[PDB]
């Protein structure tokens, strides 16, 4: 149901997270299967997301090929993120591939590479995050991105071909923690309706 306050659970088969530190709100209603919607305001970080969560022992190979069909109502005013969002363990990774995004294209770093799926081209980067908050408490960690060229808001992402791809890359993933259609916001305000997110792994629906 109604989300407003940093939780963990499942949803309709769907786990489901709110996530935000200190400073302004956000509101999230969980609806059918993977469906979520997002509202937030004066916050400096928030996350919302439905996907599947993972107990650390397999890598994405492991777990099988992943794919999320998606669409989203996505309206936020300043920065903001549509994308698929996750983690890694050993190494210890957070990692993205943003369809849609608010008054800035993340991460600003230099492009390693590019990789063309899902009907569009995206450019790949290695960040790094030093004693920042993290699934581990305070860590360092890389952050694996793949930004959409153009803005979009509903179709596939074949999650597991930009794994691929970034591993090809040199930027190599640990055990799955975590794979989840996400929207996240940036010391900003707006709301999003996923009305569609299905999670497939090996053609299978959550
Ligand atoms: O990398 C940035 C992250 O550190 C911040 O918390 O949220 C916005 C991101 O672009």
Same mark, same amino acid.
């Given at each position: ?67 999320? &069909?998606? %669409?989203? =109502? ?7 993120? *549509?994308? #698929?969002? !996750?983690?890694?363990? +050993? ?76 591993? &090809?890359? %040199?930027? =190599? ?7 989840? *259609?996400? #929207?996240? !916001?940036?010391?900003? +305000? ?17």
């Amino acid at each position: 149901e109604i989300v407003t306050d940093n939780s963990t659970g499942n949803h309709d088969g769907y786990d489901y997270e709110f996530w935000k530190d200190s400073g302004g709100s956000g509101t999230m209603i969980l609806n059918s299967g993977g469906t979520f919607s997002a509202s937030w305001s004066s916050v400096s970080n928030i996350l919302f997301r439905k996907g599947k969560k993972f107990n650390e022992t397999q890598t994405h190979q492991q777990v099988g090929n992943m794919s999320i &069909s998606y %669409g989203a =109502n996505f309206q936020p005013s300043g920065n903001a993120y *549509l994308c #698929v969002y !996750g983690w890694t363990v +050993s190494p210890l990774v957070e990692y993205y591939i943003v369809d849609s995004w608010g008054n800035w294209r993340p991460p600003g770093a230099t492009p390693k590479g590019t990789i063309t799926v899902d009907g569009g081209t995206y450019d790949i980067y290695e960040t790094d995050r030093t004693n920042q908050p993290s699934i581990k408490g305070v860590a360092t960690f890389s952050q694996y991105w793949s930004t959409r060229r153009s803005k979009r808001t509903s179709g596939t992402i074949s999650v597991s071909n930009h794994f691929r791809a970034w591993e &090809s890359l %040199g930027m =190599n993933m640990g055990d799955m923690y975590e794979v989840a *259609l996400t #929207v996240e !916001g940036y010391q900003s +305000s707006g709301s999003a309706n996923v009305y569609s997110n299905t999670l497939r792994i090996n053609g299978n629906p959550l």
